[PDB]
Amino acid sequence: TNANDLRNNEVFFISPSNNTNKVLDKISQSEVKLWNKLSGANQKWRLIYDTNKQAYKIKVMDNTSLILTWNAPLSSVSVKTDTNGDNQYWYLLQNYISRNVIIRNYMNPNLVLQYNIDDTLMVSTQTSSSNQFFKFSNCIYEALNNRNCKLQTQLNSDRFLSKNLNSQIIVLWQWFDSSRQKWIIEYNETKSAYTLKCQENNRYLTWIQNSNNYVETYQSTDSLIQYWNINYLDNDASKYILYNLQDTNRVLDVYNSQIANGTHVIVDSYHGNTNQQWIINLI
Ligand SMILES: CC(=O)N[C@H]1[C@H]([C@H](O)[C@H](O)CO)O[C@](O)(C(=O)O)C[C@@H]1O
Ligand SMILES: CC(=O)N[C@H]1[C@H]([C@H](O)[C@H](O)CO)O[C@](O)(C(=O)O)C[C@@H]1O
């Protein structure tokens, strides 16, 4: 699969290649090390690419603007405030067959991240050993692919993404445990995005393009309007934004931020407001 590829804006557990059950963990306001996977936001890392440098910032999800930082000239690594220092940039490059990634420092490309015997971390020169190979696993894919889910608007604790009765239109509605409010999330490799299938009629969350821009359940299609990028809110791993693949500046949006049963769900320009923020949970 290509679901765990090093796409920009995506969020990952970063593991040693020798153990998928240990992951990179912001332990203190400064210290990082490999740790048993428990999935708090301290163990989730967002990639922020820099096309000019062809390198990435690796940013922890729990703290505003702390990014993985080489403490030059020392051999240690920490998380520190983002100041766009060259020592805070990393080439991430993948072996296609093993899936292993080398995490190489931008400031000094002789040096690469390595995991020590006691699972602490450091930068060091590259030697063949497996102590410099990491696996990246996309958090959302690993949590949500092939799962039956419900989607709650952040506007209100009991208003959910719902196919309307005897219509194709999708609206907000309070929970009544209906198959109309149940959505199976499936990744598609050709689109590098997800479809969401209503359990009631086995049809898909789709942007219907006209003056109203309603989302509706629609038959299976290869058109981009049926595909969604599911990502965490910019600085919050409890909340999600869903971009439509037809136009990745547009997102799943509650019309006029109304909360009333039956309020239309639409596709609208991104602003990051509460009406474009969703809580996704397994049923
Ligand atoms: C999301 C959804 O399907 N809502 C439907 C509700 C619920 O089925 C009902 O509240 C169950 O308690 O019923 C209606 O109001 C109705 O019967 O006229 C139509 C509406 O589309
Ligand atoms: C608002 C936002 O994120 N826009 C970005 C989208 C989304 O990240 C994507 O729809 C969700 O994965 O990705 C890009 O198209 C990309 O990564 O090349 C860049 C674009 O600026």
Side-chain angles (χ1 to χ4, degrees):
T1 177
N2 64 358
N4 299 305
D5 288 3
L6 305 166
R7 290 164 58 204
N8 197 24
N9 205 22
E10 295 295 309
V11 178
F12 300 86
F13 296 119
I14 293 161
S15 287
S17 54
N18 80 353
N19 194 336
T20 179
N21 314 303
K22 278 195 168 198
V23 303
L24 182 58
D25 187 338
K26 174 208 161 192
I27 278 193
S28 61
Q29 300 302 321
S30 66
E31 300 305 79
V32 290
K33 45 185 183 172
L34 298 186
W35 198 268
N36 192 53
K37 187 176 162 185
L38 303 164
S39 177
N42 64 316
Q43 288 183 350
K44 295 192 186 174
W45 302 82
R46 195 188 292 275
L47 297 192
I48 306 166
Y49 191 64
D50 178 324
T51 294
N52 177 73
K53 293 177 162 39
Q54 294 180 242
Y56 300 79
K57 289 159 163 176
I58 310 171
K59 171 180 193 197
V60 74
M61 288 294 289
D62 77 2
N63 218 298
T64 194
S65 62
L66 293 182
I67 67 185
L68 197 64
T69 295
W70 172 45
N71 302 138
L74 302 181
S75 57
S76 65
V77 303
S78 73
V79 282
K80 294 204 181 168
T81 307
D82 184 352
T83 61
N84 296 288
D86 283 3
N87 61 313
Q88 310 196 286
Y89 278 93
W90 304 90
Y91 297 107
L92 304 180
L93 316 170
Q94 188 153 46
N95 179 315
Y96 186 68
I97 298 170
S98 78
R99 314 307 302 172
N100 287 331
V101 178
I102 292 198
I103 298 179
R104 188 178 299 281
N105 193 261
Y106 182 79
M107 180 175 273
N108 191 345
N110 299 319
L111 303 170
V112 296
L113 196 59
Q114 70 158 51
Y115 57 97
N116 293 334
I117 301 302
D118 73 341
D119 283 325
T120 61
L121 291 165
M122 69 174 305
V123 302
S124 159
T125 65
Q126 184 180 0
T127 51
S128 51
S129 39
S130 61
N131 43 10
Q132 306 177 324
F133 286 135
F134 297 83
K135 288 203 198 311
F136 283 59
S137 307
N138 184 284
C139 301
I140 289 176
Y141 177 77
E142 190 178 359
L144 303 191
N145 195 47
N146 257 309
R147 294 278 191 283
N148 203 19
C149 302
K150 62 187 176 164
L151 296 86
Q152 179 224 302
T153 171
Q154 174 58 22
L155 294 179
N156 185 290
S157 60
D158 190 23
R159 296 293 183 281
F160 292 85
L161 194 69
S162 312
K163 177 187 173 298
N164 222 18
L165 178 55
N166 211 50
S167 175
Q168 300 296 293
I169 293 164
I170 304 308
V171 307
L172 285 181
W173 211 277
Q174 69 196 66
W175 186 251
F176 60 104
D177 201 14
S178 167
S179 58
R180 292 202 291 284
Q181 313 176 302
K182 303 192 191 183
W183 305 87
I184 289 187
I185 293 163
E186 293 291 355
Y187 182 77
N188 177 300
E189 318 279 341
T190 315
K191 311 286 167 162
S192 291
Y194 297 84
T195 66
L196 293 85
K197 192 179 75 165
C198 188
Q199 190 192 271
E200 191 259 274
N201 68 352
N202 283 304
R203 282 149 61 87
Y204 302 82
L205 194 68
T206 307
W207 181 13
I208 298 293
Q209 289 176 299
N210 57 39
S211 50
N212 292 156
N213 292 307
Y214 297 151
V215 288
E216 304 181 27
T217 57
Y218 184 72
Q219 66 261 33
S220 173
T221 177
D222 291 326
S223 174
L224 302 184
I225 60 184
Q226 199 159 84
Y227 297 83
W228 309 81
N229 296 125
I230 304 176
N231 214 335
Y232 293 129
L233 185 52
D234 198 51
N235 215 74
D236 189 336
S238 55
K239 306 175 178 64
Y240 301 83
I241 292 170
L242 291 86
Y243 299 85
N244 197 279
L245 200 41
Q246 177 61 57
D247 188 334
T248 58
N249 305 115
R250 314 279 182 174
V251 300
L252 190 73
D253 176 87
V254 173
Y255 178 67
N256 288 147
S257 319
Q258 307 280 273
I259 66 177
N261 281 328
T263 304
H264 281 284
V265 171
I266 65 175
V267 163
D268 201 23
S269 296
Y270 173 88
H271 302 305
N273 294 339
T274 51
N275 63 329
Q276 307 187 146
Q277 299 172 192
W278 301 85
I279 296 176
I280 310 184
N281 283 297
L282 282 36
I283 291 298

